[PDB]
Amino acid sequence: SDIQMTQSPSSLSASVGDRVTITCRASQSVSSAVAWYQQKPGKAPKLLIYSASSLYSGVPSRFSGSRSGTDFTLTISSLQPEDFATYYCQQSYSFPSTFGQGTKVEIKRTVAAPSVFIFPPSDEQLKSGTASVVCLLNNFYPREAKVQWKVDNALQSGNSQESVTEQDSKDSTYSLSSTLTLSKADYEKHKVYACEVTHQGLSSPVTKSFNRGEC
Amino acid sequence: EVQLVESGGGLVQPGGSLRLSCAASGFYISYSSIHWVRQAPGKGLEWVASISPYSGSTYYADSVKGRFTISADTSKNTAYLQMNSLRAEDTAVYYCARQGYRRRSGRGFDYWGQGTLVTVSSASTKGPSVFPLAPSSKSTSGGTAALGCLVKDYFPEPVTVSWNSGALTSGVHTFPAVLQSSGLYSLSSVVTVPSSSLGTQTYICNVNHKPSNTKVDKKVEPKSC
RNA sequence: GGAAACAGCGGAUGGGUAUCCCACCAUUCGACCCAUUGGGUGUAGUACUCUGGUACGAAACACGUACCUUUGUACGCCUGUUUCC
């Protein structure tokens, strides 16, 4: 009745020039009625392969697809930099149609340490009554990074939020913002606001800070 | 040449109603199957509905059947998805898509619309406040410092941010929105610039929040001392 | 030989019939096909149907067309059996 399409891996970090193999297993026979799509962030998907193995017009010949029973694979024989994307399989053998859950492909590169900036809240937001302190981690690889907030040496937990950019188009790095949210009253109670970072590119943790009200 | 332009997305309360339309140009939908596919923020593609040519037969996903109705107006060369009794899990970017010709691309969806975001929520629309991320008031650390704008407490998504009306684009990072415990989003946009010329150069971040018809411009300066 | 009528898968056994075969029945006993309270099984023939498919038509279903298959009807053909002439 329903057909599931189990796609693996869910993510993959590969280098330029690597062969890439993405697989999709149909929970029962979907004959050859399988298509593959490429989606870049914020964009609509584009068709790559239709009928399990036919290359769609306009698509480079390094993309290919094949079928063996209920296993369908998308191969990129030599990963190119424009090939960073999420790939999806889809069965159109029966209604309802089913997509696979996607494989997100990202590009390896050399380790890059983050450059760190601390941001005190603006006087205008202080007028409203809340204080946002921001820590910027700029242009690092790999993605994994640690931010700890300290206030008068006292460790903060659960009053911060993080946001990570997608991998950059050229340098394949990420950036991260961490925002410390406190009421203005608690902001004026403490003196030292600091942001400390741990990353693979740093031999020792890095600290940017300020003293509340230093013009 | 072939295009699919969608419209009609927006914010709707649970239990509410919305009609999406998909205006085709460069082909006529009466010769093709039209599909709707959606993608929850940060999730995969999910097929929603399709309508077959010549018979008008309709198909729907398990979760939306009986609530959604797909149709095609061949006189207007436009397809529609009428969504009734919306729930929060229906929140998604909605695409219409063309199933290609049987002899040319099998059943692949060879053309896609740009997508329209449908947000299902009880929260009311709320415009953002924009606050500056002030440049380094201390000396130069690495030759350059960083500045930006914080865009806080808006609903629903999205906000778009540019700098100097788009003339300045190199080195900008606009972060994904974070949903605060208040139920409102916030995001930051930052840029890295040579600290040597902070006080002699105009930095305006251009914040656009279409769902509230809000546009804000913020000059960025280091403070008194 | 000529009509006209009826019929057409395989045993075995029995009965009669033949009295050898052959026919002719009964009974069971099989086999194969099919759309399995059943029905079909000389025919590599035709044409309509129906069953289920293949393909195409800008076409996953419906619709149209073509072909294939199945069912069943006629029709033609072969083989018999009977009655005649």
Residue with tokens 């741990």: A198
d(Cα B122, Cα B13) in Å, to the nearest integer?
Answer: 5
Fold of B129-220: Immunoglobulin-like (2.60.40)
- Six-digit token pair at B103? 């002899």
Are residues B164 and B149 in contact, defined by beta-carbon separation less than 8 angstroms?
no
Please state, in angstroms and rounded to a whole number, the distance separating the CA atoms of residues B83 and B118: 10
Q: Is B67 on the interface with A (CB under 8 A)?
A: no
Q: Do A125 and B59 touch (CB under 8 A)?
A: no
3-state secondary structure (DSSP) of residue A92: coil
Contact call for B113 and A44, based on CB within 8 A? yes
Contact B112, B45 (CB under 8 A): no
Positions of E strands within B8-67: 10-12, 18-25, 34-39, 45-51, 58-60
Residue A68 structure tokens: 């063996």
Radius of gyration of chain A (CA): 23
Of the residues B105, B117, B198, B216, the best mutation for testing chain A's interface (the one with the most A CB atoms within 10 Å of its CB) is: B105
Q: Which residues pair with A47 in a beta bridge?
A: A37
Query: In terms of domains, do A121 and A198 share one?
Result: yes
Please report which helix (H) or strand (E) contains residue A144, including its range: none
Residue B112 near chain A (CB below 8 Å) = yes
What nucleotide is nearest B56 when CA is compared to C1'? C62
Q: Can you read off the two tokens belonging to residue B170? A: 């190199």
In a domain, A199, yes or no: yes
* Among A15, A35, A171, A127, CA closest to B37: A35
Residue A97's nearest CA partner among B67, B45, B203, B170 is B45
CA torsion sign, A122 to A123 to A127 to A133? positive
Tell me the one-letter amino acid at A176: L
Same domain as A123, residue A37: no
Return contacts of B177-181, CB within 8 angstroms, 24+ apart: B177/A163, B178/A161, B178/A162, B178/A163, B178/A179, B180/A161, B180/A181, B180/B153
A12 and A103 housed in the same domain? yes
Task: Report how far residue A55's alpha carbon sits from residue B103's, in angstroms, rounded to the nearest whole number.
Answer: 13
Instruction: Report how far residue A141's alpha carbon sits from residue B210's, in angstroms, rounded to the nearest whole number.
Output: 34
The boundaries of the domain holding residue A54 are 5-108
Alpha-carbon gap, residue A40 to A62, rounded angstroms? 18
Residue A67: partners with Cβ closer than 8 Å, 6 or more residues away? A32, A34, A52, A53
β-sheet bridge partners, residue B144 = B194
Does residue A11 lie within any of the structural domains?
A: yes
Query: B6 exposed, middle or buried (CB, 10 Å; 0-12, 13-18, 19+)?
Result: buried
Measured CA distances, B221 to A15, A59, A179, B166 (Å): 41, 48, 20, 19
Class for the domain spanning B3-120:
mainly beta
Is the shortest CB-to-strand distance from B52 to strand C under 7 Å?
yes
- Name A86's bridge partners: A39, A104
User: Residue B74 has what DSSP assignment?
Assistant: T
Cα–Cα dist A211/B216, whole Å: 30
Separation between Cα atoms, residue A112 and residue A201, nearest integer Å: 6
Centre a 10 Å sphere on the Cβ of residue B5 and count the other Cβ atoms it contains: 14
Domain final residue, candidates A108, A136, A170: A108
Instruction: List A66's β-bridge partners, or say none.
Output: A73
- A166 with A83, same domain: the answer is no
Reading the block at residue B4, the tokens are: 């699919």
Are residues A11 and A55 both part of a single domain?
A: yes
Distance of alpha carbon A88 from alpha carbon A35, whole angstroms: 8
Q: How was this structure determined?
A: X-ray
Per-residue CA distances from B53 to A8, B57, B139 (Å): 34, 8, 68
C-alpha to C-alpha distance for B200 and A75, rounded to whole angstroms: 53
For residue A215, tell me if it sits in a domain: no
Q: Is A24 inside any structural domain?
A: yes
d(CA A167, CA B132): 25
Q: Is B109 in contact with B35 (CB distance < 8 Å)?
A: yes
Exposure string over B66-83, b if 16+ CB within 10 A, otherwise e:
eebbbbbeeeebbbbbeb
